[PDB]
Design an enzyme around this catalytic site. Structure first.
Site, PDB file in Angstrom:
ATOM      1  N   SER A 123       3.740  14.615  60.563  1.00 45.22           N
ATOM      2  CA  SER A 123       3.177  15.661  61.410  1.00 45.22           C
ATOM      3  C   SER A 123       2.393  15.168  62.633  1.00 45.22           C
ATOM      4  CB  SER A 123       2.260  16.545  60.568  1.00 45.22           C
ATOM      5  OG  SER A 123       1.173  15.777  60.066  1.00 45.22           O
ATOM      6  N   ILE A 157       9.274  -2.439  48.689  1.00 44.45           N
ATOM      7  CA  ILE A 157      10.585  -2.817  48.168  1.00 44.45           C
ATOM      8  C   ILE A 157      10.802  -2.155  46.807  1.00 44.45           C
ATOM      9  CG2 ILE A 157      10.383  -4.999  49.380  1.00 44.45           C
ATOM     10  CD1 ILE A 157      10.057  -6.409  46.634  1.00 44.45           C
ATOM     11  N   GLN A 217      -4.552  20.173  62.239  1.00 49.22           N
ATOM     12  CA  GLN A 217      -3.590  19.523  63.118  1.00 49.22           C
ATOM     13  C   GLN A 217      -2.877  20.517  64.019  1.00 49.22           C
ATOM     14  OE1 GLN A 217      -1.123  16.363  61.291  1.00 49.22           O
ATOM     15  NE2 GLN A 217      -2.334  16.681  59.431  1.00 49.22           N
ATOM     16  N   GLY A 227       1.716  30.890  58.960  1.00 47.23           N
ATOM     17  CA  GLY A 227       2.805  31.856  58.990  1.00 47.23           C
ATOM     18  C   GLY A 227       4.151  31.299  59.427  1.00 47.23           C
ATOM     19  N   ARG A 237      -8.567  19.583  55.658  1.00 43.77           N
ATOM     20  CA  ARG A 237      -9.874  19.701  56.289  1.00 43.77           C
ATOM     21  C   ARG A 237     -10.304  21.136  56.561  1.00 43.77           C
ATOM     22  NH1 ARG A 237      -8.369  15.583  60.900  1.00 43.77           N
ATOM     23  NH2 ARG A 237      -6.327  16.314  60.132  1.00 43.77           N
ATOM     24  N   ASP A 293      -0.270  11.556  46.522  1.00 40.39           N
ATOM     25  CA  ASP A 293       0.250  11.337  47.865  1.00 40.39           C
ATOM     26  C   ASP A 293       0.046   9.889  48.245  1.00 40.39           C
ATOM     27  OD1 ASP A 293       1.086  11.311  50.447  1.00 40.39           O
ATOM     28  OD2 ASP A 293      -0.492  12.629  51.217  1.00 40.39           O
ATOM     29  N   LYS A 320       2.514   7.886  49.619  1.00 41.68           N
ATOM     30  CA  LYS A 320       3.432   7.472  50.681  1.00 41.68           C
ATOM     31  C   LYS A 320       4.104   6.136  50.337  1.00 41.68           C
ATOM     32  CE  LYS A 320       1.676  10.467  54.074  1.00 41.68           C
ATOM     33  NZ  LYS A 320       0.587  10.987  53.170  1.00 41.68           N
ATOM     34  N   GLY A 372      -3.629  24.138  60.235  1.00 37.92           N
ATOM     35  CA  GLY A 372      -5.071  24.138  60.358  1.00 37.92           C
ATOM     36  C   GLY A 372      -5.566  23.071  61.309  1.00 37.92           C
TER      37      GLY A 372
END
Ligand SMILES: O=c1cc(O)n([C@@H]2O[C@H](COP(=O)(O)O)[C@@H](O)[C@H]2O)c(=O)[nH]1
Ligand SMILES: O=c1cc(O)n([C@@H]2O[C@H](COP(=O)(O)O)[C@@H](O)[C@H]2O)c(=O)[nH]1
EC number: 4.1.1.23
Lengths: 214, 213
Positions: free
Chosen positions: A118, A67, A176, A181, A194, A61, A63, A174
């Site tokens: 998020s 360029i 955040q 579901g 976390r 991850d 991100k 969780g």
């Protein structure tokens, strides 16, 4: 397809803790997301360490948001280190994405396109670009996407754009405030950090997560 | 203020070559930008190696672009490794930027805010957000910025937004087609990578770049 639709976000920052906690929940997952908190603390060798110890898929991850020329280098080094997939920001544009796709194709790995994020700040600039970023991904043949658990209606819109055949994973459940579901109405798997790795009993936390989406 | 208004973008991907080439041009610069190509190939220890070998300022070009909580961790690890400054994307918003500012203030280091980028794809989404990103930085007390050598009128507008007191560095000169002289009408320093580190004679390339300005 990911075991139990659950991807562990391993953002602990020392190898002993990261390996110990991942070991505690190894029975519940076969896919771990490793990001810069762990990599910048322990080195890129940590990726190979996870793959060998747990037999898991690793999503790097990172991100990626540079360029094209620099993106290519980042992807090469990352895949050389054994990552199965890399997460790339879409906001820097199509050339920057294609650079990553080129290396992934060459090396037999995958790119995940990060559309909307998020956290609250995503509202400022990212949200307004997100539908178009998703469409850009579709137009380029991107098959894997990341979208936000914390905004179910946005996640639903992104699913509409990418179609039922694309793979969509979603962080924000969780800690955040996202709901596993609801999120899995649209996402194929949820990312959880976390609420598992800071849990008094991470195995119980993981089992609990899976239980609630059984 | 950086020596000769020239920041080396050291994006070679092995220690020997990166250290050798940086040594060849050490006379011309006191500030090196180290990014993920070098760091992911050689490890975060490379930062401390540069600082000790060259006595230079190090800007960690990590284009930090995560949620606040993760941004904080990235900045902590980076400053722990000795980086004097870190480059942070503005596109993910104010909370993500503040997370970096918090750590930077705590540890006595600097944050550079990346506004508009230099490559073609920046037209798609970044360019339209860039003025507001710059303004967001100003409103939060950001003093260091990155903007594109390849779009002089955009760079000029960014300078207008951030004011004369802010520090603005600019990549895209050389390989990407930007002009050093034109760029320095607005930026305080230029970032230069390939046109130096891939040069047959990097010292001559650095001297040449400086001579032209
Ligand atoms: O939109 C985004 C994209 C992400 O990759 N992530 C990330 O996914 C994880 C979320 O972890 P947590 O469950 O602790 O909130 C982190 O590693 C983080 O950087 C995020 O939370 N929101
Ligand atoms: O808008 C941007 C921001 C950057 O940091 N950079 C970067 O600055 C450098 C440019 O190097 P070069 O002179 O070889 O084009 C690279 O390290 C690259 O990732 C960019 O070129 N344009």
């Amino acid at each position: 397809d990911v075991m139990n639709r659950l991807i562990l976000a391993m953002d602990l920052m020392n190898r002993d803790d990261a390996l110990r906690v991942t070991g505690e929940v190894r029975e519940y997952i076969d896919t771990v997301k490793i990001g810069y908190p762990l990599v910048l603390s322990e080195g890129m060798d940590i990726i190979a360490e996870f793959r060998k110890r747990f037999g898991c898929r690793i999503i790097a991850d990172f991100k990626v948001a540079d360029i094209p020329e620099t993106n290519e280098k980042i992807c090469r080094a990352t895949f050389k280190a054994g990552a199965d997939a890399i997460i790339v920001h879409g906001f820097p544009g199509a050339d920057s994405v294609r650079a990553c796709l080129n290396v992934a194709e060459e090396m037999g790995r995958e790119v995940f396109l990060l559309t909307e994020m998020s956290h609250p700040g995503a509202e400022m600039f990212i949200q307004g670009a997100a539908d178009e970023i998703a469409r850009m991904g579709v137009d380029l043949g991107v098959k894997n996407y990341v979208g936000p658990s914390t905004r179910p209606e946005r996640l639903s819109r992104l699913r509409e754009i990418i179609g039922q055949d694309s793979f969509l994973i979603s962080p924000g459940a969780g800690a955040q405030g996202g709901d596993p579901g609801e999120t899995l109405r649209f996402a194929d798997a949820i990312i959880v950090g976390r609420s598992i790795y800071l849990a008094d009993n991470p195995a119980a936390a993981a089992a609990g997560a899976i239980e609630s989406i059984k």
